[PDB]
C-alpha cells in the first residue's frame, strides 16, 4: 500500500495526487504489468514489484 490512484481506460493512463501537488499522469502499453482498468478499479502507485500504476 502507498497511494490511491485512478486510471482511465480511455487514455490508458493513471494519475494521482502526490506531495509535490503537481498532478502526474502516465500512459501504459498493452503488455503485461502495464494494463489499464477503471479509475477506482485497482489503480495504485507501487515501486516494490516494479509494477506500474495502471488499473
Read off the CATH number of the domain in which 15 is found. 2.40.50.60
Cell 490508458 sits on residue: 12
> Which residues lie below 8 Å from residue 32, measured CB to CB, with a gap of 6+?
none
14 DSSP β-pair partners: 7, 26
Burial class (CB in 10 A: 0-12, 13-18, 19+), 36: buried
Indicate if the alpha-carbon torsion angle 12, 34, 55, 3 is positive or negative. Answer: negative
8 A C-beta contact, residue 54 and residue 13 = yes
Largest alpha-carbon pair distance within the chain?
30
Compute the distance between CA of residue 23 and CA of residue 49 in angstroms, rounded to an integer: 23
Segments forming the whole domain that contains residue 19: 1-55
In the chain, the number of structural domains is 1
- DSSP codes joined into one string, 1-55: --EE-EEETTTTEEEE--TT---EEEE--SSTT-----HHHH-EE--SS---S--
Q: Dihedral (C-alpha) 41, 7, 4, 51: value to the nearest 10 degrees?
A: 90
Experimental method: NMR
Q: Is the separation of the CB atoms in 2 and 19 below 8 Å?
A: no
Amino acid at each position: 500500500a502507498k497511494y490511491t490512484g485512478k486510471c482511465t481506460k480511455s487514455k490508458n493512463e493513471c494519475k494521482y495526487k502526490n506531495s509535490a501537488g503537481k498532478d502526474t499522469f502516465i500512459k501504459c502499453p498493452k503488455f503485461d504489468n502495464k494494463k489499464c482498468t477503471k479509475d477506482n478499479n485497482k489503480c495504485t502507485v507501487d515501486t516494490y514489484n516494479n509494477a506500474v500504476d495502471c488499473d
